[PDB]
């Protein structure tokens, strides 16, 4: 062994050891808290704390040890806190109510030229706490299975002592820089300042510094600007560009704190003002109701406001910026004046309302950035970008608040705990965006999604979820895993299934959520070129849920997206499924299973709220005929056998093993080819029947409607529909001795296949002649109705076939009979 | 396993009992003598409750035999230590552990 | 209605607070007018203590505005697959564009003073490399529409307004020195992405507007979805305005360059690209006229779409006029041999029929004037 | 680190423990080389064993 | 040997580059004229477009490229005006055909057949064949006209370099295969002579050709040079020079040392074995450095590279190749395995404390801001506990 300080002269060992520290940082990088705990055994807390203060350490080793401390103990917490620092969830508590734009002062309680010290005071925006675990290598190891144990927390290090040491070290560095010695700590001014400034910035962002510590930091930055109501601060020390970059990071933190203070003051004023507005409206309603209502017109005009939606009521009650009478806006003059005063205060705070020393954070940052740019041709592009971003923020303060407000959100006290839990889960999900998916990450993602979906705040504050961008994060994770080896069978199908369950309920929670997810339909359709074998929800399911039963979004649908789906369907109708071929299924030449999924999406695109969307229906029909392979081999013009023959052949296939499956089963032998063919054709007929025009359009005689109906009739003969409807179903029976011989619903012709034929018959051909009605009743409907009636015995009542027949009769057959 | 070899005597009377919280200071080394853990490095005594299976079996039994104020060397075999799995990145598989444990107090 | 009677005073406090924040941001903060662009540009253009720097060497260190422009030029010149959306660049491009204002009968002296003021404001930027930065950013966009290229085109228009000959010379010299095909490839791609009147989109928008509300305005979307018909008309006008301003003042060199780039390995005829877009727009306008021919009166939505299409067509006609005026004989010949005559024939048909249709209802007098 | 205290004999020519680093993990005293022989109460030290 | 119409990214590759060679030496660089007979040469393969009685339109070798088979002309239209003759001119001549603008029909002079696309064969669309075979037909189609597009000097030079280098390295591989398994005892090498000098000079020239731009350059110039370097790397990779370099490396790696090589190739040839191996590894590193597409190729044959880390003749070069691949390709990071990590650690164990191995291990952990937990855990478990 030797003294580590010998590496100042032993340069090869110095380089190797600095790269070893880099390797430690790399192996614990980006949230590997387990490896951080392991590294705590190799570079212990005493060693790290000693290295922090070692003034003789070579510069590379000093920087490496500072970075190692940050990586092991602070990097994960700092990243998690930074991810949340851009949102302002303000709970409506007394602490929030007490927040004011300007500090109460003798010169003026609100409005004075003197801001409060940035980053000092009361902040109420919700930020989840930091979680650490003690480093200890004598504890009993958890026998719990891997990929199931809770994720390791970052190793703990005494934060109070660390922050005190950091402040002392920064002060010492400032003093030494003032003295201008010839032996700077670490070998240079950069190696002396950059590590300490990095540590201080990390702790500041983590939010561990107290108010006194923040005041000390501000006084170190600028003694005069941040004096409380040596004489040279950091900002004027002739510092290198890396040190300037660190100073820019500190100034960025303090500007962010000022913006947060503005947002919170706005939230508190909003609470008080909204209370007053609501009270005034209640009083005015009382007066209006208690009035004699001499003029019915006057009463109706007054009640227009109170019958308007609340958002419009607020807009009307606030529309008095440029003046208004007591009729266009009944808000009293006192309340108007209160809003005007607050607006003036906000403009003054932002500097909008309108010396050799700055006297404010905005002026200080502006002057410092401009002076740096004037003094040197800055060579670091990162430094240039940072200082010009700071300058833009200083010059446009109102714009910064305007762009930050969309991410502000006020909640009641009762929601704070659930919001904190949701924020913790969202933090975990966000942290999983910088790591390659594995079993542990998949388990964590699934658990976090489940917790979010079981959290009440998720359902009650969809606007908050959208502002937090939860859907975008989940979609990003899903698309990461899907793109990973796109051609190769995608891994983590369980996590993709959860990727719906979350996003794919999220569309349903609210209409705005549905629109937000619809905005990503092309991306979902881009990544939906696979699936099926998932046996669970898919990005195609997300696409369907983003448009289901929304007339506005269905009309907003794009012909390009419809074309992409139709092209997928054509591919499915032309090629067999490679996954099935690998599993050993017979090669039938096409992919009914995927075709059915694409047809289902098209059905949801063309049918909305029980009515056909004419634009989408016509576009879909045109695309389908332009790519005839989408109709399946049966409806092929030249060699097609017809729908009836195709269904009969599918029934034969289902009855014959070694043609229906591999014949060498997580769910019913996975897939059965006969049932898949029947389901594909049923879905196609359903889609075409739903594309069929509406009766009112037909009566009006629109040429497009008549042409589309003629095309559909040419595609599907009536006799084929009647034959399929007349095909017999296999009903449950009793055999042997009390053995319930039931059909396999997943491998046989089922009433759901007849339901699509009935829908097509009703919507395209319709029943208008008594002879045809009686013929179809005699051949197809009555046998099924009699079978359903006969299956009403206690033994067969709840059988799968009995329930399917009941659904078929009550959803397709009987309503048609009532209509006819 | 666990062998206990006294380094400095204790009071000889007060021995830990099940449910009592032992507050100790320890330094852990591998059989070949490589240090891997120490509470003195963190400058904070380690506290653990007897009978709660919080620490390894070797620690449980050795500290049970130890007395208040005593310093002792615990030699713990693999079966009484992290065994075949070990502690990935810290303790190799099938490693005998040596600890220099001082029983500061019981609470 | 009366049965519903949804009052604001019954809403939970936090919901009312969120609604108030939205409304206040929309009506009081967003409406606030605060001009800082000129002050910012002046402050950044001012150099400081050059005497202390003792920069007697000919190469003066760039001032802060020059350094900002150089940073954005470096970002544009970086080799990448795509140009990432840069909010900082967009904001500073907007600031620079607004710094060149381009502001009864005004005297000849007043007009000259305004022109000189605009020239000085534009020189503040183009003496710092803003023209080359604009060209580099257009090339880097690689033909992809978006906020970045929109801001770049607006900045280029701001520095070229009035037919700035010095800016035109700098841009032409840079293009001919670099001999890069990417700039005109990007221009052609953007021109091809420019949209025209879409009758299917019009019908879909009509149906969407027809759909009514049944719940609170906040709960419903209010069918305020961005326009689906010629949604990028502003970008199209900006693109063709930039191309026009490149030739404004009868710049023969740049007029010829827009037709043929002799030094480049491949050339793109921007004149014919403009003619192709004009033909597409003319066909869309003819389709719109045929859609409305049967109807007695054009509704307000159709009138607004017609007006947008006519404004775009006006800009395109001005661009072609600037291409050929001076005259540029080569551009005249290329247009004469292009499909411009077919577009003019279609436009004449549309003009002739729409004049008579609109003259029959005084409610469309503004549309008739625009036509 | 546990306080070091050892007593014994050492050979004049050869026993030269310099401050700081050395054999093993440093802190070399009596019995940390083959020129000295020390006792610490529990162990006999020689050759750093 | 077959010609196609293809419109994918091939429009920027070297296999679509052709050279027009008039049937004369003097003033061959004169302006091309309608009806002027000429040959069409494929630059990267050196083969000539021609008509064969048994296969039709193909590219033939220069040895079989006689005028009747390989003579073509450009015609403004398909009308039968060729009756009009033409006389050679001692000068640049009249400019007739223009790049981009002129539309030209290619006609085989001897037969008069027109260059056209073969009738779309069935199931090609299903197979995904976006390329249409080209043929010579009596009538052709109306859209047979071709546009001549100029290529950059960089692309032309790269194509010629690819042709020459492919020839040289294929000759080298053939020479090695000649004595692959034939010990010479004490006699002659028993094979074909190796182009050692040519191979060494070519490798050095290509390393200089692919040298990255100097960091002491202006940003604009550096970006242009990086763009050119990436384009040239892609051209060589697409023409398959990377595979050729790998094959040469394999043939030379069959031997463990210079003496072992001498046992089959002779002492004179073995005097350059180490130099050639090191130059080949250097060229591979230059060819893949900074190129994600080229680096991702190793995701399939990573073991090929990792298994060679312990070779003592080119240890640093092999490590540099691995460093480039890991730095550029996340795909390789996602297929890294415990045996690979153990081999890299064994490099530290057996070669000493080299910080470049630590850099390789660092690059195994995080790429482009995304961490690989499996790699991190494997490194931690196999490197730290031993101490």
Numbering used by the authors:
A (entry chain A): 1648 to 1876, 1923 to 2047, 2089 to 2398, 2411 to 2566
B (entry chain E): 2 to 108
C (entry chain A): 3635 to 3737, 3752 to 4019
D (entry chain A): 679 to 727
E (entry chain A): 244 to 630
Please, what does the article write about this entry?
RyR1 is the primary Ca2+ release channel of the sarcoplasmic reticulum (SR) in skeletal muscle, where SR Ca2+ release plays a crucial role in triggering muscle contractions. Using cryogenic electron microscopy (cryo-EM), previous structural studies revealed the homotetrameric architecture of the 2.3 MDa RyR1 channels exhibiting a mushroom-like shape that consists of a huge cytosolic shell (head) and a C-terminal pore region (stalk) spanning the SR membrane. While the cytosolic shell is mainly formed by a large α-solenoid network interspersed with globular domains, the transmembrane domain (TMD) possesses a 6-transmembrane-helix architecture (helices S1–S6) typical for cation channels, including a pseudo-voltage sensor domain (pVSD) (S1–S4) and the inner pore (S5–S6). To solve the structure of simvastatin binding sites on RyR1, we chromatographically purified endogenous RyR1 channels from mouse skeletal muscle tissues.
To facilitate RyR1 pore opening, the RyR1-activating ligands ATP (10 mM), caffeine (5 mM), and Ca2+ (30 μM free) were added for rabbit RyR1 (33). The activating conditions enabled separation of closed and open conformations of RyR1 via 3D classification using CryoSPARC software. Improved resolutions were obtained for the RyR1 structure without simvastatin: ~2.4 Å global and ~2.2 Å local resolution at the pore for the closed conformation (N = 224,439 particles) as well as ~3.2 Å global and ~2.9 Å local resolution at the pore for the open conformation (N = 26,588 particles). Comparisons of RyR1 structures with and without simvastatin did not reveal significant structural alterations in the closed or open conformation of the pore.
